[PDB]
Design a protein around this ligand. Structure first.
Ligand SMILES: [Zn+2]
Ligand SMILES: [Zn+2]
Ligand SMILES: [Zn+2]
Ligand SMILES: [Zn+2]
Lengths: 68, 68
């Protein structure tokens, strides 16, 4: 069972703004293969933003992001 | 950034024993609704034993389960 439901993602936090839990939609990078994952909320997804990661990930603007 | 993410899944709980977070391996149903998730811990997946949540109108014995 998903924790928090479908509008609260207690299993990840935004790498750009640090929000936790991710409220709303969640976007997850499929290119960053580091174990920690790379995730962002919608606001940070929609905003042009250079955050390479919060846990020493290597996320480049060419990386692809999908929603869960 | 995913919390846990290795033997700790803060985005899911077992539908069989209600444990949360699922510590250890996590099995997720691929046939149940993408929205309404169905998850199990290792113990509940491997054990052949009735629990009151072992199958429902939504999650049915033909459903397939994958590892995370
Ligand atoms: Zn990335
Ligand atoms: Zn954000
Ligand atoms: Zn199912
Ligand atoms: Zn269980």
């Amino acid at each position: 069972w998903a924790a928090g439901g479908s509008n609260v993602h207690f299993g990840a936090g935004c790498d750009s703004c640090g929000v936790y839990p991710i409220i709303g939609d969640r976007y997850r990078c499929k290119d960053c293969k580091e174990e920690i994952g790379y995730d962002l909320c919608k606001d940070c997804y929609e905003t042009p933003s250079k955050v390479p990661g919060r846990f020493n990930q290597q996320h480049t603007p060419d990386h692809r992001l999908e929603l869960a």
